[PDB]
Amino acid sequence: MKDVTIIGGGPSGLYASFYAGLRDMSVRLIDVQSELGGKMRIYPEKIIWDIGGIAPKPCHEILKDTIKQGLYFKPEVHLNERVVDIRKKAERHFEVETEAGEIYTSKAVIIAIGAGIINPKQLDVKGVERYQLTNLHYVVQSYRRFKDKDVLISGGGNTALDWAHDIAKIAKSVTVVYRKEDVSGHEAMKTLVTDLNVKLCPKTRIKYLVGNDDETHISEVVLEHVESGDRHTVKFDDVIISHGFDRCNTLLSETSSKLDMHDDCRVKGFGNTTTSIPGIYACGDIVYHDAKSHLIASAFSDGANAANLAKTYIQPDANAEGYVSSHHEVFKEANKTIVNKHLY
Amino acid sequence: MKDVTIIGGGPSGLYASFYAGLRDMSVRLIDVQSELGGKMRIYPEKIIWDIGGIAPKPCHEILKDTIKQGLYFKPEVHLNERVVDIRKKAERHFEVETEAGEIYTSKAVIIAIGAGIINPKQLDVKGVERYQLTNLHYVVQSYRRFKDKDVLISGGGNTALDWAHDIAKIAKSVTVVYRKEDVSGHEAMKTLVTDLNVKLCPKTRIKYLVGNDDETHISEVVLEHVESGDRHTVKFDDVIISHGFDRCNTLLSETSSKLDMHDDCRVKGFGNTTTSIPGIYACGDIVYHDAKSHLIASAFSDGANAANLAKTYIQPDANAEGYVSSHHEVFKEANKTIVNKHLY
Ligand SMILES: Cc1cc2nc3c(=O)[nH]c(=O)nc-3n(C[C@H](O)[C@H](O)[C@H](O)COP(=O)(O)OP(=O)(O)OC[C@H]3O[C@@H](n4cnc5c(N)ncnc54)[C@H](O)[C@@H]3O)c2cc1C
Ligand SMILES: Cc1cc2nc3c(=O)[nH]c(=O)nc-3n(C[C@H](O)[C@H](O)[C@H](O)COP(=O)(O)OP(=O)(O)OC[C@H]3O[C@@H](n4cnc5c(N)ncnc54)[C@H](O)[C@@H]3O)c2cc1C
Secondary structure, eight states: OEEEEEEOOSHHHHHHHHHHHHTTOOEEEEOSSSSSOGGGGTOTTSEEOOSTTOOSEEHHHHHHHHHHHHTTTOOEEEOSOOEEEEEEEETTEEEEEETTSOEEEEEEEEEOOTTSOOOOOOOOEESSOGGGOSSEESOOSOOGGGTTOEEEEEOOSHHHHHHHHHHHTTSSEEEEEOOTTSOOOHHHHHHHTTOTTEEEETTEEEEEEEOOSSOSSOOEEEEEETTTOOEEEEEOSEEEEOOOOOGGGSGGGTSSSOOOBOTTSOEEOSSSSBOSSTTEEEOSTTEEOTTOOSSHHHHHHHHHHHHHHHHHHHOTTSOSSOOOGGGOGGGHHHHHHHHHTTOO | OEEEEEEOOSHHHHHHHHHHHHTTOOEEEEOSSSSSOGGGGTOTTSEEOOSTTOOSEEHHHHHHHHHHHHTTTOOEEEOSOOEEEEEEEETTEEEEEETTSOEEEEEEEEEOOTTSOOOOOOOOEESSOGGGOSSEESOOSOOGGGTTOEEEEEOOSHHHHHHHHHHHTTSSEEEEEOOTTSOOOHHHHHHHTTOTTEEEETTEEEEEEEOOSSOSSOOEEEEEETTTOOEEEEEOSEEEEOOOOOGGGSGGGTSSSOOOBOTTSOEEOSSSSBOSSTTEEEOSTTEEOTTOOSSHHHHHHHHHHHHHHHHHHHOTTSOSSOOOGGGOGGGHHHHHHHHHTTOO
16 A cells, blocks of 8 residues: 555645655656646746745746655656545545546645645747747736736636736726636626726637747737637737636535534644644645745745655654655665766 | 845845845845855765755756846845844844954844855865765765765764764764764763764864775775874775754854744744744744744745745735746846846
8 A cells, every 4th residue: 555645746746755765765756747847837037036945946946856855766647537536444544536546545634735736838939939038927916017008818716816906006908808607706807897997898718929039028919709600810918817816716615524623724833734634634725834935945945844744644653754865775876877977 | 324234144144135125125134154155065976956946956057046036126245244132222223243243234134144154065075076976975864875884974963963873773883973072962972972883083183185096986085183193094885974053052042032943953934934033034944933944945935934924024015025037027137138138
């Protein structure tokens, strides 16, 4: 029987996988996406600066390193598989069941599902290459940059509609294209509908992202009606791609085992990655504890803690923490080649 | 007046410096060593694997990246300076005083002192280069590798004497060279003295670390008596350099402001980097909270949390957390050059 099943292949699940391997635990890693990376697959061309010890470079580049790390010890990896239920048969005996009916057994379970299912939108860029785009946004925090700008927002989820309203306060115009399979959320919509500089475009998708010359920005967007198929090209200064996150619609609402939940539908972490059920640990954006940050850095330190607690759960007399890698015997064979051949 | 004074230039203080800069805070960074890096300056040639997202490479290489990160926003850096006192004159008004009598003012204080003063021993290696040594150890956790080995340990601190005893259980012989300025600790010494395969060498230092041929290991060590100056060369299979850490002998025992302390002389973190005094935050190995790991990864996530809490302390209406770097406006000018010139 596998030592631990890890649900979620984002940076938190990946590091948890690595550190569980560092602690000599057999690992099963499950993720619904066709590739590992979680939310990081949303913003591949973006330059990341705030990961500890990592000089700024594209997210997809850092992701490649993070994935490699998660797979050093070669865990049992299951992609394109969606967990729907978690069960505790007994102590050191858990069942993890997918929507396809597959049932996986483990002595422990690590939940690293972030905010739920990630399904990145496939953007088709013409004229420019995506890796050099500047006016393409996947999240809105500061919106002062959008002053007097013609802004496009894709997605009609509550968060996207909130962004639209805030941006509308100073933007020249805001256009929201979406499909109404998006929530869309009555209150967020009611607020937005009286922003008279906002155009709502239901049943509409982004077909093409177009930029001229060489340029490093999108200058115009080809929009397409989902039903009629009619297209028209509109110029924008900024394009914002929302994804629609709802932490309240994960499996944790309808599994066969209910962890205590934070009021925002995050798993209640008891000081750390410990949950209300012994043997189950939550790491990353899904868990709440006082030391949390919404950062990849925090996802990593959570992963370590989840692996440690899972290790001591399976084997109580084991060390509380893992051996530091600098003096860990498992890396020595590789270290000599790395040093001798200067593989860094 | 400076926003925050950060005491300690290890990975935790460095990231805290970076993230404080990310949150648009003015920073003063103080460390007693002649160079930044903290404990990482102890094991520069060692290959590190367990930092999130970072492929294995020498510690000094990762340190260079970590230092660069800590200094992006160009804080006020004070090296070769030892803090001896911390004072809270009023809310958003702190005094940080060094042994030389210098007094620095800040609206907040971040304590990142690890286990206390770090003063790396200068090893002189002959025959081989340090970067390829394998049998050189700076910490002992697993000691099974020392079975039937002739082992040398430098340092007579309690921890080093504990290592010596454990190793003596399976080693062919253990030699402990030290100066008695080291504790040495009565009980640890009393335990060790009846290990009849252990040779105690007081008033003795390591002069030379010698390896033959090209080789990737130390084959023999030149020892020197501190008083007489007499030398003799002894062959060893492994060399262990202890440093002597005592968390109970930091400034936190005799400042003008007492944080609540964990029973192991670590600062009591209230769920995170929060201490018993508003405006003072502890990040890294110095602080205890339930989400802690003794890892660089945890030092980083602590640093972020300490910067955030310090930010909201100085400016209560500010956002709880900082803007993700991927969409942070402060990095955009640099991002275009990084992308255009492929500087990664
Ligand atoms: C646009 C954007 C920009 C960001 N920029 C930065 C930045 O610059 N620096 C930084 O530190 N952080 C940044 N972040 C945050 C960072 O991406 C997250 O903190 C991090 O991805 C969280 O890692 P995680 O593993 O905990 O969750 P996730 O990354 O969300 O991983 C969850 C994975 O588990 C999968 N999954 C979920 N549910 C189930 C199920 N029931 N069955 C199977 N599989 C499943 C999901 O599909 C997903 O792949 C950014 C976030 C976004 C959205
Ligand atoms: C030999 C060894 C191997 C390790 N290997 C790994 C590994 O492979 N992976 C990993 O993740 N971790 C590893 N670690 C642990 C890692 O080094 C620590 O977790 C990390 O350095 C802690 O960072 P810090 O900033 O909190 O403390 P520190 O690194 O100790 O930084 C403290 C700094 O503040 C300075 N300072 C202290 N006090 C005062 C004062 N009163 N005034 C002024 N200045 C001051 C100190 O001199 C020091 O420079 C290892 C530790 C050691 C000793």
